[PDB]
Design an enzyme around this catalytic site. Structure first.
Site, short mmCIF file in Angstrom:
data_model
loop_
_atom_site.label_atom_id
_atom_site.label_comp_id
_atom_site.label_asym_id
_atom_site.label_seq_id
_atom_site.Cartn_x
_atom_site.Cartn_y
_atom_site.Cartn_z
N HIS A 56 56.03 -34.95 60.89
CA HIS A 56 55.08 -36.15 61.41
C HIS A 56 55.69 -37.17 60.64
O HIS A 56 56.58 -37.02 59.49
CB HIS A 56 54.02 -36.29 61.61
CG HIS A 56 52.95 -36.09 60.30
ND1 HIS A 56 52.71 -34.76 59.44
CD2 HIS A 56 52.39 -37.06 59.63
CE1 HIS A 56 51.93 -35.17 58.63
NE2 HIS A 56 51.73 -36.38 58.69
N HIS A 106 54.43 -39.48 58.31
CA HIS A 106 53.90 -40.19 57.08
C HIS A 106 55.07 -39.50 55.76
O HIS A 106 55.82 -38.90 55.94
CB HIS A 106 52.52 -39.44 56.74
CG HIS A 106 51.42 -40.00 57.64
ND1 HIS A 106 50.50 -39.27 57.75
CD2 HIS A 106 51.29 -41.14 58.22
CE1 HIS A 106 49.44 -39.90 58.63
NE2 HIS A 106 50.14 -41.21 58.79
N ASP A 112 54.61 -38.21 53.21
CA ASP A 112 54.68 -37.06 52.32
C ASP A 112 55.51 -35.90 53.41
O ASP A 112 55.79 -34.74 52.87
CB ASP A 112 53.12 -36.40 52.35
CG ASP A 112 52.49 -36.13 53.57
OD1 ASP A 112 52.33 -37.08 54.47
OD2 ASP A 112 51.68 -35.36 53.64
N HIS A 116 46.00 -34.22 63.39
CA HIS A 116 46.30 -35.28 62.06
C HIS A 116 47.16 -36.52 62.50
O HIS A 116 46.63 -37.67 61.99
CB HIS A 116 46.89 -34.47 61.13
CG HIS A 116 47.51 -35.45 59.70
ND1 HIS A 116 46.50 -35.80 58.87
CD2 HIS A 116 48.54 -35.81 59.66
CE1 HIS A 116 47.27 -36.40 57.94
NE2 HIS A 116 48.43 -36.68 58.76
N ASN A 160 43.38 -37.43 55.13
CA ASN A 160 43.80 -38.67 55.46
C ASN A 160 43.77 -38.86 56.83
O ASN A 160 44.79 -38.57 57.40
CB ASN A 160 45.02 -39.33 54.65
CG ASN A 160 45.22 -40.93 55.00
OD1 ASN A 160 44.67 -41.34 55.84
ND2 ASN A 160 45.94 -41.25 54.21
C1 LIG Z 1 49.46 -40.77 54.64
C2 LIG Z 1 50.03 -39.58 53.55
C3 LIG Z 1 51.14 -40.09 52.83
C4 LIG Z 1 48.61 -39.35 52.58
C5 LIG Z 1 48.23 -40.25 51.58
C6 LIG Z 1 47.37 -39.78 50.62
C7 LIG Z 1 46.60 -38.85 50.83
C8 LIG Z 1 46.86 -37.93 52.16
C9 LIG Z 1 46.32 -36.84 52.79
O1 LIG Z 1 45.10 -35.94 52.36
C10 LIG Z 1 45.20 -34.69 51.67
C11 LIG Z 1 45.95 -34.64 50.43
C12 LIG Z 1 43.86 -34.15 51.77
C13 LIG Z 1 43.71 -33.07 52.60
C14 LIG Z 1 42.50 -32.44 52.78
C15 LIG Z 1 41.32 -32.87 52.07
C16 LIG Z 1 41.65 -34.17 51.07
C17 LIG Z 1 43.07 -34.44 51.13
C18 LIG Z 1 47.11 -36.58 53.85
C19 LIG Z 1 46.61 -35.37 54.82
O2 LIG Z 1 45.47 -35.07 55.09
O3 LIG Z 1 47.80 -35.08 55.63
N1 LIG Z 1 47.83 -37.32 53.77
C20 LIG Z 1 47.99 -38.11 53.00
ZN LIG Z 2 50.12 -37.40 57.43
ZN LIG Z 3 49.79 -34.86 54.75
#
Ligand SMILES: CC(C)c1cccc2c(O[C@@H](C)c3ccccc3)c(C(=O)O)[nH]c12
Ligand SMILES: [Zn+2]
Ligand SMILES: [Zn+2]
Length: 232
Positions: free
Chosen positions: A85, A87, A89, A150, A181
Site C-alpha cells: 500500500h 504508506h 512503511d 487498513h 494507524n
Molecule cells: C502511516 C504509517 C507510516 C504508520 C506510522 C506510524 C504508526 C503506524 C502503524 O501502527 C502500527 C505500528 C501498529 C499496529 C497495531 C497496534 C499499534 C500500532 C501502522 C499500521 O497500523 O499499519 N502504520 C503506521
Molecule cells: Zn499503512
Molecule cells: Zn503499516
C-alpha cells in the site's frame, strides 16, 4: 538469537531478517514517526537465483540497510519489489531500490495515493487487482486484493510453496490491543475484507502482520476483533 525480533531490540537504521520457511524470510526494521518508534515487517521470497521483495524497510536509509543485510545473509540479488500500500512503511525506500536497479511495482491505486501523499512512487503498475477478490501471479507469489481495510489499496501476498500468508497492514499481530494507524482505513469494510482473506487462504500455515509477530490463522480473526472494538 532466534525469537522474532521486537521494537526495542532493533535500533532505527538496522535491519534483521527472520527465516519463515524454505526460501521465505521476513525483514524487520524500526522507524520514528511523530515522536514514537515502531517496528515493521516486509517479505523476501526466493525466485530461483533472484529474490522478490515485498515492501520497503520504512525509509531510505533503512532500505539501503535492508539491501546490505540481504547481501550478507542471502547473497542473491533483489530484482523486483512490490509495495502493498501507499504508506511510508511500504514505499519509503523505493527510490533507493530503483537506483539499485530493482524494478518496483504497486497497484495503480497505490501509485496514485503515494503520489498524492508525497511518498515515493513505485515505477510499474500492477493491473488485474482493482476488484475485491482479485488475484494475480507475480513470480513465486500470488497477490490478492481483499478490499478496503487498513487502507483502500492494501494488497496481501501468498507464497503457495510454503503456505505463507503475508497480510501486510490489513492484518494485526495477536498482542495488538488496538487497530494501529487507522487514518486511511475503512473500519466498516475491514472485517469483510478479512473474511475474504480467510475464505481464500484456508490452508495458510504462517500469517505475517504488517507490524509485529507472525503467527497462525488466529491473526485474521483477531484483526477483525480489534477493528470492530476500535470502530465501536
Ligand atoms: C502511516 C504509517 C507510516 C504508520 C506510522 C506510524 C504508526 C503506524 C502503524 O501502527 C502500527 C505500528 C501498529 C499496529 C497495531 C497496534 C499499534 C500500532 C501502522 C499500521 O497500523 O499499519 N502504520 C503506521
Ligand atoms: Zn499503512
Ligand atoms: Zn503499516
Amino acid at each position: 538469537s532466534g525469537e522474532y525480533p521486537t521494537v526495542n531490540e532493533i535500533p532505527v537504521g538496522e535491519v534483521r531478517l527472520y527465516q519463515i520457511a524454505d526460501g521465505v524470510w521476513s525483514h524487520i526494521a524500526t522507524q520514528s514517526f511523530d515522536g514514537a518508534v515502531y517496528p515493521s515487517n516486509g517479505l523476501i521470497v526466493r525466485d530461483g537465483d533472484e529474490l522478490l521483495l515485498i515492501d520497503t524497510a520504512w525509509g531510505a536509509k533503512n532500505t539501503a540497510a535492508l539491501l546490505a543485510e540481504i547481501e550478507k545473509q542471502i547473497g542473491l540479488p533483489v530484482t523486483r519489489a512490490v509495495s502493498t500500500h501507499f504508506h511510508d512503511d511500504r514505499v519509503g525506500g523505493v527510490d533507493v531500490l530503483r537506483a539499485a536497479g530493482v524494478a518496483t511495482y504497486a497497484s495503480p491505486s497505490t501509485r496514485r495515493l503515494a503520489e498524492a501523499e508525497g511518498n515515493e512512487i513505485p515505477t510499474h503498475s500492477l493491473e488485474g487487482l482493482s476488484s475485491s477478490g482479485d488475484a494475480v501471479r507475480f513470480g513465486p507469489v500470488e497477490l490478492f486484493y481483499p478490499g478496503a481495510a487498513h487502507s483502500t489499496d492494501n494488497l496481501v501476498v501468498y507464497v503457495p510453496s510454503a503456505n505463507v500468508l503475508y497480510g501486510g497492514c490489513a492484518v494485526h499481530e495477536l498482542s495488538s490491543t488496538s487497530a494501529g494507524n487507522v487514518a486511511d482505513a475503512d473500519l466498516a469494510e475491514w472485517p469483510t475484507s478479512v473474511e475474504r482473506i480467510q475464505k481464500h487462504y484456508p490452508e495458510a500455515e504462517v500469517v505475517i502482520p504488517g507490524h509485529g509477530l507472525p503467527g497462525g490463522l488466529d491473526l485474521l480473526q483477531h484483526t477483525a476483533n480489534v477493528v470492530k472494538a476500535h470502530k465501536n
